[PDB]
Each structure stands twice: as C-alpha cells, then as structure tokens.
Amino acid sequence: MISDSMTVEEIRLHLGLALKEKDFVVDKTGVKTIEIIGASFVADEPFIFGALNDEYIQRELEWYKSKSLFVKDIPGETPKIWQQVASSKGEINSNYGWAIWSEDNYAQYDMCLAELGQNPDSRRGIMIYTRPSMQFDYNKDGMSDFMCTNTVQYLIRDKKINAVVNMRSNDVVFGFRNDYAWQKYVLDKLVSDLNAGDSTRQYKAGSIIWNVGSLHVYSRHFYLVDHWWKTGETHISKKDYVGKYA
C-alpha cells in the first residue's frame, strides 16, 4: 500500500543483495542482469543509482511534448540507444507524450483529467500507454520497442493525487531516473490543471508508486551497485571506480 511500500533505499539494498549473491539473469542480448521481480516501491527519491542528468531529461521532455514517433526529432544528436531501437524509417513506439497527448492514442491525459474533474474519487482515472496490438507493433518495420510503461493510474485521496505507475520493464540506472522525471512532470501538470479548473479543489501532488515486472540493472552498471554496496555512495564515475566489475 501507498502508506508503507518499500523505499528507494530498500530497493538499493535488494539490488545489492542480488549482485552479492550473483543472482544473474541473461538478457535478450546475451548480457547479465540482476533484477527485482514484481517490484513495488514508493519513489521517494528521483534516482536509484547514477548521476543526475537534468539536460538529457529536458531533451526527452521536449521530444515527448512534440509527440513525434521518430527518434531524430529528439533535440540534438539522438542517443545511440534510440537510434538502435528505431525502425528502418527512424520510427519507435515509446514516445510517452504521444501516449498521453495524441488523439491517435485516444486522449489519455485529457480523458483522465475530465474523469477526475467530474468524479474526484474515481477509480477510472488512468492513462493507458501500451495497447493490445503491441504484441505485433513492437517490431513494426524492424524497430525493437515493446512499450515499457503499461498504465499510470491517478487516485485523489485526502486532496493528494497519487500516481500508480505500472511498468513491465524498467532499467534502474537511466530508465528509472528519466521515467521518474516524466511521471513527476505529468503528476504536477495534472494537479495544476485540476486546481486551475476549480479553486475549491486545492489538490497537491501525492506519492508516486512504482510497480515493475522486471526492475533490472545491466552488467555495464554493476560497478554502480557494487560501489554503493561498499560505500553508500549512489554514484561514482567509471574512471574513479575500483572494484570487481571493470
């Protein structure tokens, strides 16, 4: 429950235990990962491991606001991971701004906003990112992009808007930090939009609960887990790192 879920610090602990026990899972690409399966925690920090990168997150936000399904429209030089997963025409699925703001995904943000505006206690206030046809759309034109966020539900209780984020898959290092920033953005916008609609509502942002089928770290980031395991420091540069994982 929202009231006492796991914290991010406890998520760190369990990832550390998974690495120390060598609880390894081979990836779709043949690499090792460690995982929490069925993860569920309150996102009480904006990152788990790694450094801040407000600048990349702002670029991704602008790409989301454009709703463009083409990775080249990401501001500046598009990251290599986006180039790799895109189709032969540069197209993807996981533009989250498209997911919640495009008419072609059935106006998720606006309909959730309207639902909660008419019934503050509604259990039907939700933004549905993925879609049944994703079973076939994830590799359209040779892309490799099976939507990672399934749904985000918004529940207003005691004048706080809580977000229940349901993801099938989330990378602990870049993924969570970028996706948290996005979900906090949408939550704050929804609070502001509802408050602007009626001054008697007086809502504030509540808790963001993170639910992930596979919350994982790739072997290329094991050094971050190991360094935190040994020192409590959530970040170290790869150059400075001294330890087992290169």
Added chain:
Amino acid sequence: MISDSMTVEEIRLHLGLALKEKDFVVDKTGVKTIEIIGASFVADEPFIFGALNDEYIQRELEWYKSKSLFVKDIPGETPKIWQQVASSKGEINSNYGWAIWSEDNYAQYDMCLAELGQNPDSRRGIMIYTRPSMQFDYNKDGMSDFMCTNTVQYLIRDKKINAVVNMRSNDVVFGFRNDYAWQKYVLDKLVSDLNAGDSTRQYKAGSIIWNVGSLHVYSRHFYLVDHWWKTGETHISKKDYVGKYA
C-alpha cells in the same frame, strides 16, 4: 518484490484498520468504501473475505472460454451485477477470455506463449487486457464497464512462472476471489502449454503478485471485515452476523 510482498493476511489487517479508523471513501454510486491504494501483495490465499463459491467461478470460466461479449451467455441466470453494467444490447467489455483469446484483442495468450517459448527469460511476456480506446469504450451503448484488469505479465525465473497482475480496481469480496481463480487458471494453463512444448523446460507455477490501484470493500460487506476483525473468521453468513454494520 516477489520475495517478500505483503500477504493476504496482512491485507486483511490493513482493511480492518481502515474500517476501525472509519477511513471512508464515497463510491461512484454514493455508497461508502474502504480501500488500500496502490495495493501490492502476493496472493498466497485464494480469497480475502467471504465464502467459497466454486460454482459461480466455474460459470464465469465457461463464459470466458466462450469469449462472448454478451452477459446473457453467462451460463444460467446471469447475475444481476452483470445485467446492470451491460449495454442496451446486453454487451460488456470485461470478458477476460475475450481479452486473452480473441483475435480481436490481438491474441494476447498465444503471443505471450510464443514470446516465452522462444525467450524463457523475456521481459516482454505479457497479456494486455485493457486498451487506450477504453477511455471511450467503457460506456459504449450505455454499458458501464471500464476494464478493471490492465495487464498480466509472466516472468519465468528459476523454472517458476510468476504472474504480475496489474488491476486499476478490484472488489475485495467477490472480485478478488473470482479474479484470483481466473489468473491461477491462466497461469496453470501457460505452465502446461510451455511444458507440453518442450520436456526440457520443466516449469512450475510460481507466485501470483496482485497490484491494484484501488483494492476496496463496499459498505454492504463491512460486516465481513468487522467479523474477521473481532474473531479471525474470514467468513460469516449475513444472518449470523452480530455487530455494527447490519
């Protein structure tokens, strides 16, 4: 995480505490509910409160296997709740057999089966019940049926198939017990289908993790919570009940 989520017995405790503290939420129909928001627990029992009803569950299973979107096709006299939520033509959305077996919902079961058959470690093995167009489809032709199950993801680790059930809304009393029976059915079928595909796999059913945006009890069932709170008995007939909630 799968390893130590809440148990059903702890879910009972928290619902009991919600009732004792009069933590009430008014329903879409003007009635009271108590809730766990962002519930996440291992379904280590097949019910929370209430009596067994294997016979109703078997009728619902047959209706799911028919994939019929019409409530009259439920075997026997269709329950009043199904008649109430159906459209002017008797139609609904939430036939879960349609959701996972119909071609019109993009072959969720078969595609999840194929995905896990080719990549046992896949994070993309999922059955997507709801859909973005649900923002408009939930009241087609005057029905009132916004799909309650969003997604169910299947993760095979250490030869155990775990199910991560993501629901926006679940009634503790009839809902959870019926829906648990269904999700356990699908999980066992998926295990059997994968094992029948290759005798080296040797999978077994793992844990079913239940994630619910609003896991709630309606006031008409508060007596069950209260009786359990006072006695530890998970069921009492309404006739036998003596206490505050009629």
